[PDB]
Swiss-Prot record, chains A, B:
Subcellular location: Host cytoplasm; Host Golgi apparatus; Host nucleus
Covered residues, full protein: 3264 to 3569 of 7096
Name this protein carries in UniProt: 3C-like proteinase nsp5
Quaternary context: 3CL-PRO exists as monomer and homodimer. Only the homodimer shows catalytic activity. Interacts with host FBXO22; this interaction promotes the proteasomal degradation of nsp5.
Reaction catalysis annotation: TSAVLQ-|-SGFRK-NH2 and SGVTFQ-|-GKFKK the two peptides corresponding to the two self-cleavage sites of the SARS 3C-like proteinase are the two most reactive peptide substrates. The enzyme exhibits a strong preference for substrates containing Gln at P1 position and Leu at P2 position
Effect of K90R: In strain: Beta/B.1.351
Length: 306, 306
């Protein structure tokens, strides 16, 4: 019945997006209860961004210098502080649309939805993964800083990403909602290069399970393998090593399809060695690695949210 | 700065989804002002679906047989009628969350977002195209019927699709919001096969323009072509014929990049003849055809919505 790259419904997050302006710089903020969270580089000029001293730049800013606008209506800033690379602006009004929420710091390989915004207004929603090199491959133009990534479990939004930086290579870097960057990146306009973008092996396997459930099975073979034997081939192809924890997480997909995890590893190994020979799997000519095992279960089951 | 398959923010549509139950069948409805729109096959049993006489089945249904539930709260049905393949259930309460909206019947090649729902509750959002054979390639399980497709232009939601049927081949068929199917499909469980799924040429070209804007340009060559010469190769590869209307629509992308439309056609022609040779374009090993020229402009510019 079909399998699609699918984002969470975005309404709960749309009701949290505001515009934040400091000086000549405008980007997005996240309004939850009576706090607005945004990237601290809102206080920088494009001059400042080469070597900013954020503590010093903040000395010159008062509450009234942070212009916060929710739709057409202005919010009153009654306090501000810096936590790592985010500012927290206390406003005098609790966001009436605040959903149940959590702040979560995700691990490489985990997926989330991004609500890309400009000037506090939603532009679109798409699905991303935290890459093993701690970048994400997004769609972000100037003014999109402060857009957030999130997951939803029924009624509760877990915010995991806030967007801050584009690297010279066109990939993206950002923080969790406590303001700590994922990976080694900093909020300065300098030479920072991403490391190897390896493939998230457990996600590829989950997606192969999804393909089998949906009728694409030409890649199933007569072979099996072992974790160590498969991992020799994964390393050669810049795939993440597969662990027993990963095998365990694939357990429910293995059980429903009747295909042992290591048998699916042997299918993956032949795909890596032989290529696709011009065929497709679930409409892709590449092996997709931005579906987690939990994503596959969810979509193949029809789980929903408030 | 990156280019992603991107859906519209879904909040405005989330506030319109309800659950509709008739007998033992539950699916989704769309609540706009004081009318709930849903597939007429809600009145069928799985028996009925082999050869339904919808007019006859409706004789046995009264207002009180249609159970409409918005979140936890029941809506009072004060009238019902059948329009083509949709039912319209008049309720006694206008949806307080009704956005500005229109009903639009789209053309093959046009794209839209789908809010997949189960039991009136949103599950996820993804982007789709109306295929040239009038199917869509979605992600729909039992109970997702009545999920809708839509586009947004600033504050106004244009609803273009309601989901009704999965064909035996795993592709999807549905109606506009006046209840007329796209293509030749009917709401009966019978032998209906899709025609040729051809590639939407103008969308592929738009996506190649997007790639150039974002740094992927290895596929640009030293050649040009003509509409007629390109169309001979398109036919061979089951690509839609390119028209002068299509060339005109690509005009703004041509102007911004400085690459004449027919020059990009010559790049596409070499890609079709030679394949990708194992390379990728914007993270795909296939030529993507579910971005319209307007989608590319929008995403490459940062246009937003209420
Ligand atoms: O729409 C429909 N009609 C339908 C019609 C005929 C056969 C099967 C179906 C199903 C019914 C639920 N069936 C869920 C089975 C399942 C799959 C994966 C997992 C898991 F591994 F992810 F956990 C668990 C259960 C999916 C297909 O759906
Ligand atoms: O974020 C940023 N910083 C930035 C930094 C350096 C160079 C360019 C930029 C741009 C500035 C706007 N620029 C829009 C140009 C444009 C592209 C396509 C079209 C169209 F063909 F679709 F119509 C029209 C205009 C995109 C990149 O963006």
């Amino acid at each position: 019945s079909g399998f699609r790259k699918m984002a969470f419904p975005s309404g709960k997050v749309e009701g949290c997006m505001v515009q934040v302006t400091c000086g000549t710089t405008t980007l997005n903020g996240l309004w939850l209860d009576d706090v607005v969270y945004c990237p601290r580089h809102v206080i920088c000029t494009s001059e400042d961004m080469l070597n900013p001293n954020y503590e010093d730049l903040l000395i010159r800013k008062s509450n009234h210098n942070f212009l916060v606008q929710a739709g057409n209506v202005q919010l009153r800033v009654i306090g501000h502080s810096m936590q790592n690379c985010v500012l927290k602006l206390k406003v005098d009004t609790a966001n009436p649309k605040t959903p149940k929420y959590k702040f979560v710091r995700i691990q490489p390989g985990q997926t989330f939805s991004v609500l890309a915004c400009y000037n506090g207004s939603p532009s679109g929603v798409y699905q991303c993964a935290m890459r093993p090199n701690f970048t994400i491959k997004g769609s972000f133009l100037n003014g999109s800083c402060g857009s957030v990534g999130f997951n939803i479990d029924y009624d509760c939004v877990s915010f995991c990403y806030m967007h801050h930086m584009e690297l010279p290579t066109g990939v993206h870097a950002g923080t969790d909602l406590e303001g700590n960057f994922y990976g080694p990146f900093v909020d300065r306009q300098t030479a920072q290069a991403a490391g190897t973008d390896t493939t998230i092996t457990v996600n590829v396997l989950a997606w192969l399970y999804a393909a089998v459930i949906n009728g694409d099975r030409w890649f199933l073979n007569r072979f099996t393998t072992t974790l160590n034997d498969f991992n020799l081939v994964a390393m050669k192809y810049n795939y993440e090593p597969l662990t027993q924890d990963h095998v365990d997480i694939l357990g429910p997909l293995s059980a429903q399809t009747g295909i042992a995890v290591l048998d699916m590893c042997a299918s993956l190994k032949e795909l890596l060695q032989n290529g696709m020979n011009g065929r497709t799997i679930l409409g892709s000519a590449l092996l997709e690695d931005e579906f987690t095992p939990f994503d596959v279960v969810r979509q193949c089951s029809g789980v929903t949210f408030q």
